Structure 1
Amino acid sequence: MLKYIIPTMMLMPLTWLSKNSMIWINTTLHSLLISLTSLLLLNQFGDNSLNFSLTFFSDSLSTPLLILTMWLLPLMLMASQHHLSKENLARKKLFISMLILLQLFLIMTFTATELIFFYIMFEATLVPTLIIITRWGNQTERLNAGLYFLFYTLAGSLPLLVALIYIQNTMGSLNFLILQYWVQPMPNSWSNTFMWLACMMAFMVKMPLYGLHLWLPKAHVEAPIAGSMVLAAILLKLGGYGMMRITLLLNPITDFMAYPFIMLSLWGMIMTSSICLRQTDLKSLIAYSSVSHMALVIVAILIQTPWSYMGATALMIAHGLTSSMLFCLANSNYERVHSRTMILARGLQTLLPLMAAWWLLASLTNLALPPSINLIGELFVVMSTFSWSNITIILMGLNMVITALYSLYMLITTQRGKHTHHINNILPSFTRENALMSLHMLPLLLLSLNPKIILGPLY
């Protein structure tokens, strides 16, 4: 993966040597070129995963996540330039540099074959996200949000390092290829119970799990727009990828250890949809929607059936695109009205019709309108959970009803009704915001034509 890392570490001198007015243009251009050359990762074989060297590899699971990361970086680059126009040039270059560094760490995270390398990069993503949130935020509680995010992650994940080093010392290697062939059954004891806990609670705090989700609606509503995109669309999926990689070594203990996390995620997705029904803010609404969808992904990964895995990976890719677009729309409205309250401005369809169309498309894909990949993932998880137990259809259907309710409540309160009277600075939508919306939509709708490329390693 040296043909994708080296262009990233060459993007860093590109933004550090550019002119005063051409940083955004050049960096957007060359990150789009990297996103184009990312398509060579689709060389997948029906039996063997694509292996590069001793340290890097790419099966069919990490390929959509890699394409999503290196496609997402230009989008944060376009959308993070209207609130940094009045910024010092060195600070703008520092912001861009942390974005490139975070993308480099993310692509060195999914691909790394050896597990402790994946852990090193998985914790290396903590520093630039915290710096972006706590430096280029807007509110007072950004410092508290950074503290909550960092400490939830690290307090959940240092036992993961201890358990991983123990696994290295017992099995003899932490390479993932060898662990597919040197795996052993893990018997019934308290020691294996705490090993399972140490291996799983890090990823499910990052995911997040219900009850441990308190870091998410703080770190999303005080971050900038690019930080919110990279939090919602990629950084939540490190937990899912880690779960998919690490449940290999946790057999046959998961069939009676994963019950309380399943109950937590089911009642948590119900409760977080209910929260979205009574939220006074747009950003917090999208944050709790993310918590609900990630609870769905947790259930799918925990029950570990092939249909659940297909639905899980489709769900992560589709949710990443949808949540990123919703955050972009909310930030455009926040730039227009300079306030975060959903009920403040109303009836924007009469003033901004094309942005209302983009709002409609995002809200429709969020409530899993077929044949989009959102309902593809949701549908596969629904069949898998019905195979697991029948009362899951009751729980899943209640979740779907409340999901449609809050998506259309958000659409009606933001776009429909009588327009507000005393707010008179609603400028027409720029070509930049519309281009960003179209760049979020068009891959998401086009992936319904050929959805076989995001259906996991066991397609």
Structure 2
Amino acid sequence: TFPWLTVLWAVPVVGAAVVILLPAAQQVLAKWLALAVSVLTLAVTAVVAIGFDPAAAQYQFVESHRWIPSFGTGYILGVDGIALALVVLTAVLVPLLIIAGWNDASRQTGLAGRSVQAYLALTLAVEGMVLMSLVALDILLFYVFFEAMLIPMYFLIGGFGGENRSRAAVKFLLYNLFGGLIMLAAVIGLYVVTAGSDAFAAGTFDFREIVAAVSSGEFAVNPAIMNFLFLGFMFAFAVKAPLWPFHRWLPDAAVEATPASAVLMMAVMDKVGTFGMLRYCLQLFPDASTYFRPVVITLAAIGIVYGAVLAIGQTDVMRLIAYTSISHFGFIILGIFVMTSQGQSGSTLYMINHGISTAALFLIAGFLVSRRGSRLIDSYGGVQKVAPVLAGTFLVAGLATLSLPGLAPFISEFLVLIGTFTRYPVVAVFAATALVLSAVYILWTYQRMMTGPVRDGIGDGDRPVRDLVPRELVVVAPLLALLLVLGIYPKPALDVINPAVEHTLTTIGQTDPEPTVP
């Protein structure tokens, strides 16, 4: 009965509170304490995952309390296979991002000496609020945390960043908050509809009850209202997890923010968009999702190819990785909205693999960018000679983001592509071209940077490119280790994800299409 889920999200926020409250002189102690809180949250995640039985009921570790009955929302947490997977992703990443951004806040001034403490506390608050969103089984609670986590990252981008930090932070927050406010419109519409229907005792936000009612058919509502509410949810989840048209904010912010914070935005937080698409959009609005399924599928595939192309066209390392993440988000959304067990399971595993892979690749690029203070690709050359280990890890990460079977991401992309073929073969081929496009923007980048004659000031002067330090080794090794393990033996993660995907597909009245042959 222990509040495992509640503690899981509480610990990061309380840790941020303690950290920001430390004396400025305890900066080193602040770093260590933040790392310790992250590790404690990861241990909580470990116990939650171990106790979770994917063969058991859909929702586990369910904690329920009354929070705001006037709004029909209660503090209800419960972790399913998909939420468990993303929770494990967030937990494993956050300590690594902390030890990745160890010195990121050193060169800041002001904040009464709390710049390091502010950085770490903001990171912890983001981690905890993302966790709260993931394990929240209350629509309004989830929206609360989903929208609010924009603010800690808005600060984390604006402070602790490059020259365009102000502009990129504003664009990020405004895009995402406009989406969130559209989802607030949709949330209030959903509350009104539930209040207008006899299926519920009163206007309700309990996700489980609403899902059960819509599945049981009792909660019968006009398809027009459902379409509009679905669109409201979709706009916010699309701007959050960048669906092609709305991606525009992510490139700048990822470029401007410090690499650890940018990875925290992309690998962890942006996932919450697709997560919502998987949990709410499909399981609240099955008929609307089906009706809009072709258009969203088209948008996701176009996003895949479009992000791949733009990454190809990027002169900037960080912008290239951001567009690569956009294309991978296109993959995730495509796999989620194809409503195929292969598709949804592959897209969940793809959220995991893309989180880890982008984290590794982007952090390696961030170290390289730190060594020489230029983000321009042409500013480098022959780095493979000076920093062999940096180049090796960068190549491994690229291979991961390249969807090579020897690494994790392939297992997912494949699964998604397979899923897309059973319902939209043209779209499946259109996305499969991204296998080629990924090779392009990955290997061309590595060629321009690591190979060729060593560029000026690369191995000499005041800005040489020194190899990876031990701390960067600690950051990098676990990520590549997970990539290898999940590529070789995804069986545990897939076994966790599949029951949740099957539950979802049963919920929305969809099934994997039968093979052509009888």
| TM-score grouping bracket, smaller chain normalisation | over 0.9
1: CA distance between counterparts of 2:160 and 2:285? 41
Aligned residue for 1:134? Answer: 158
Give the TM-score taking structure 2 as reference length. Answer: 0.84
- Give 3-state SS (helix, strand or coil) of 2:444's partner: helix
CA RMSD of the aligned region, Å? 2.0
Are the counterparts in 2 of residues 186 and 250 from structure 1 also a CA contact under 8 Å? no
- Give 3-state SS (helix, strand or coil) of 2:146's partner: helix
TM-aligned CA deviation for residue 151 of structure 1: 1.5
2: CA distance between counterparts of 1:2 and 1:195? 29
The one-letter code matched in structure 1 to 2:436 is V
The one-letter code matched in structure 2 to 1:179 is I
2:483 alignment partner, one of 409, 421, 444: 444
Are the counterparts in 1 of residues 357 and 400 from structure 2 also a CA contact under 8 Å? yes
CA 1:175–1:286 in structure 2 vs 1: closer, same or farther (change >3 Å)?
same
- Give 3-state SS (helix, strand or coil) of 1:53's partner: strand
The one-letter code matched in structure 2 to 1:341 is L
Are the counterparts in 1 of residues 162 and 257 from structure 2 also a CA contact under 8 Å? yes
- Give 3-state SS (helix, strand or coil) of 2:432's partner: helix
Aligned residue for 1:158? Answer: 181
Are the counterparts in 2 of residues 64 and 453 from structure 1 also a CA contact under 8 Å? no
CA 1:453–1:168 in structure 2 vs 1: closer, same or farther (change >3 Å)?
farther
Aligned residue for 2:212? Answer: 181
Task: Tell me whether 222-231 or 85-94 shows the greater mean CA deviation.
Answer: 85-94
Task: Tell me whether 306-315 or 447-456 shows the greater mean CA deviation.
Answer: 447-456
CA 1:275–1:87 in structure 2 vs 1: closer, same or farther (change >3 Å)?
closer
Task: Tell me whether 126-135 or 264-273 shows the greater mean CA deviation.
Answer: 264-273
Deviation readout 1:84-121 (Å, 9 max, x if unpaired): 33445322112111111111111111001111100000
Are the counterparts in 2 of residues 65 and 317 from structure 1 also a CA contact under 8 Å? yes
Deviation readout 1:30-59 (Å, 9 max, x if unpaired): 422331332112212424021321211101
Whether 1:458 aligns to 2:506 is no
CA 1:186–1:346 in structure 2 vs 1: closer, same or farther (change >3 Å)?
farther
Are the counterparts in 2 of residues 188 and 253 from structure 1 also a CA contact under 8 Å? no
Aligned residue for 1:50? Answer: 60
Deviation readout 1:245-275 (Å, 9 max, x if unpaired): 1211213233332322222222232222122
1:219 alignment partner, one of 253, 267, 283: 253
2:145 alignment partner, one of 121, 125, 146: 121
Give the TM-score taking structure 1 as reference length. Answer: 0.94
2: CA distance between counterparts of 1:291 and 1:5? 27
Alignment of 1:418-437 (within 5 A): 418-423=453-458, 424=460, 425-437=464-476
Are the counterparts in 2 of residues 186 and 192 from structure 1 also a CA contact under 8 Å? no
Are the counterparts in 2 of residues 12 and 100 from structure 1 also a CA contact under 8 Å? yes
Deviation readout 1:357-398 (Å, 9 max, x if unpaired): 111211111111114331111111111111012223431232
Deviation readout 1:141-165 (Å, 9 max, x if unpaired): 2212112111211222223222222
2:12 alignment partner, one of 3, 8, 15: 8
2: CA distance between counterparts of 1:5 and 1:204? 24
TM-aligned CA deviation for residue 286 of structure 1: 0.4
Task: Tell me whether 111-120 or 86-95 shows the greater mean CA deviation.
Answer: 86-95
Unaligned runs of 5+ in 1: none
Alignment of 1:237-276 (within 5 A): 237-246=271-280, 247-276=282-311
Question: How many residues were matched structurally?
Answer: 458
Alignment of 1:27-426 (within 5 A): 27-42=34-49, 43-48=52-57, 49-54=59-64, 55-87=76-108, 89-139=113-163, 141-171=164-194, 172=200, 173-183=204-214, 184=217, 189-246=223-280, 247-423=282-458, 424=460, 425-426=464-465
Task: Tell me whether 195-204 or 448-457 shows the greater mean CA deviation.
Answer: 448-457
Identity over the aligned pairs, expressed in percent? 26
Unaligned runs of 5+ in 2: 65-75, 195-199, 503-518
